[PDB]
C-alpha cells in the first residue's frame, strides 16, 4: 500500500487502472474473444471498465478553442477545462503513429520533466491521460508565442537577444542540471509567458545524460537548421557528446535572430547537413550585416567543435562574454526584470500570437503496453 500512493512510483492507482483498462483495450476483439478464457475476463469487466473509462480524466472534459501547433505525431490544442473554466494547452501524441514510425519511448522524460522539474525555465505539465488512440499532456498554457513568431514581427535589436538570449542560457542550464541534454532547441520551442519571459518545451528530444556527464546516443536528433556537428556526427555510430550540443544551437538562434536567416541553410537537407559540417568553411555573416563585434564574437564561439566550444566549462564562462553588457538586468535576476516584449492579453484564451492550423488484429498484439503508467494527476 506504500508504493501504491506515490505517483512516481511504478506501481501507484494510475498505472495499475491503465494495465487494467489497457488490458481490456488489447483483449476485445472478436478473433480473441475465441480463446475461452479472454472472453471470462471480459465478461466480468467489460461493463465496469467501460464505467470506470467514463469516470477518469478524458479528452470529453476539456473544450478545444483551437489547434495552436501541430507536430510528428500530433497536435497541441488550446483547450478550456469545461467543469473548472480553466485554461490549458493540450499536446496530443498518436500512439498508432508513435508505435509505428518511433523510438515510442520519447514522451516518459517529455512528461516526467514537465510535471517535476518546477523550473521557471520549464512549462509545467498539470495532468497526463490517455485513451485508445492518443496520449494527452495538459499543461500550463504561454500565450505569448514562440520566438519564431516575435522575430517573425521585429526587428529584432541587440538589446533584445541579449536578453531572450540569457534567458535561453539560464533555461538550458536549468535542463542541464537536472542531468538532461536538450538535444532540440530551436526559437519553435521557446514560449514565452503571461509576462513575456522564456520557457522551454518539446522534450520530446531529451536525453538524460550518465555519471560522467556525457550521452551516448547512435541516432541524429533534432531539426536540421539547428542539429550540432557531434550529433549529427553521432548518426553513425559511436555517438559521444555532453551538454556542449544545446550551446552550439543557442548559436544558431542568435544567429538567426540578428541576421534573420539560419547560419548554414541550404536548399536540401543535405545541404544544410553538409555546411553543418564544413562550419568553418562555410559560416559568414552577410557583408550588409550590421552584426556587433562582440555578438559576431560569441555567435563565432558556439559554431565551432564541441573540443572547443564555449560553454564546455560551464555556464559561467558564458555569463561573463562582453555581449552580455547591459544596462537592463543581471543574471540572477533576469526574470524579475521587465521583459521587452510584454504580451497585450485581453482574455485568458488570447490566441493571437498564434497563427492558424489501427488494424483488427487477428492474435494478441499488446499494442496498449507501452502506455501502461504514462495516466497521472498533479
Ligand atoms: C517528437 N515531437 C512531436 O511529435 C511533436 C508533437 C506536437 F504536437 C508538437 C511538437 C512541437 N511543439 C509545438 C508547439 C508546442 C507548444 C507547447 C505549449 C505548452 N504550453 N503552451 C504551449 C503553447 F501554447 F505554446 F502551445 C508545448 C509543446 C509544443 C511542441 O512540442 C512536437
Known amino acids: 500500500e506504500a508504493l501504491i500512493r506515490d505517483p512516481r512510483s511504478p506501481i501507484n492507482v494510475e498505472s495499475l487502472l491503465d494495465g487494467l483498462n489497457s488490458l481490456v483495450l488489447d483483449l476485445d476483439f472478436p478473433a480473441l474473444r475465441k480463446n475461452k478464457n479472454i472472453d471470462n475476463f471480459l465478461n466480468r469487466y467489460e461493463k465496469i471498465v467501460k464505467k470506470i473509462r467514463g469516470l477518469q480524466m478524458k479528452a470529453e472534459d476539456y473544450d478545444v478553442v483551437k489547434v495552436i501547433g501541430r507536430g510528428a505525431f500530433g497536435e497541441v490544442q488550446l483547450v478550456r477545462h469545461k467543469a473548472s473554466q480553466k485554461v490549458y494547452a493540450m499536446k496530443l501524441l498518436s500512439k498508432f503513429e508513435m508505435i509505428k514510425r518511433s523510438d515510442s519511448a520519447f514522451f516518459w522524460e517529455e512528461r516526467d520533466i514537465m510535471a517535476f522539474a518546477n523550473s521557471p525555465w520549464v512549462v509545467q505539465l498539470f495532468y497526463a491521460f490517455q485513451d485508445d488512440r492518443y496520449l494527452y499532456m495538459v499543461m500550463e498554457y504561454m500565450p505569448g508565442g514562440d520566438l519564431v513568431n516575435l522575430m517573425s514581427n521585429y526587428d529584432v535589436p541587440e538589446k533584445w537577444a541579449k536578453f531572450y538570449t540569457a534567458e535561453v542560457v539560464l533555461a538550458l542550464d536549468a535542463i542541464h542540471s537536472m542531468g538532461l541534454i536538450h538535444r532540440d532547441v530551436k526559437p519553435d520551442n521557446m514560449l514565452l509567458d503571461k509576462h513575456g519571459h522564456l520557457k522551454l518545451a518539446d522534450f520530446g528530444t531529451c536525453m ?105 566549462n560551464g555556464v559561467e564562462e558564458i555569463r561573463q562574454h562582453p555581449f552580455f553588457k547591459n544596462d537592463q538586468w543581471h543574471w540572477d535576476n533576469i526574470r524579475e526584470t521587465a521583459a521587452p516584449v510584454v504580451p497585450e492579453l485581453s482574455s485568458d484564451i488570447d490566441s493571437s500570437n498564434f497563427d492558424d492550423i489501427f488494424p483488427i488484429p487477428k492474435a494478441f498484439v499488446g499494442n496498449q503496453l507501452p502506455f501502461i503508467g504514462f495516466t497521472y494527476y498533479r
Not at 212 to 222: E, L, N, P, Q, S
Not at 285 to 299: C, G, M, R, V, Y
Request: hydrophobic share 35%; with cysteine.
Open 208 to 312: 538524460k545524460m550518465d555519471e560522467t556527464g556525457m550521452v551516448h546516443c547512435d541516432t541524429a536528433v533534432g531539426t536540421p537548421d539547428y542539429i550540432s556537428p557531434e550529433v549529427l556526427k553521432s548518426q553513425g555510430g559511436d555517438g559521444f557528446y555532453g551538454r556542449e550540443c544545446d550551446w552550439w544551437s543557442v548559436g544558431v538562434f542568435l544567429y538567426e535572430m540578428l541576421v534573420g536567416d539560419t547560419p548554414f541553410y541550404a536548399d536540401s537537407l543535405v545541404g544544410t547537413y553538409s555546411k553543418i559540417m564544413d562550419h568553418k568553411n562555410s559560416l559568414c555573416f552577410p557583408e550588409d550585416a550590421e552584426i556587433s563585434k562582440h555578438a559576431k564574437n560569441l555567435i563565432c564561439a558556439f559554431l565551432t567543435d564541441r573540443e572547443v566550444r564555449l560553454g564546455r
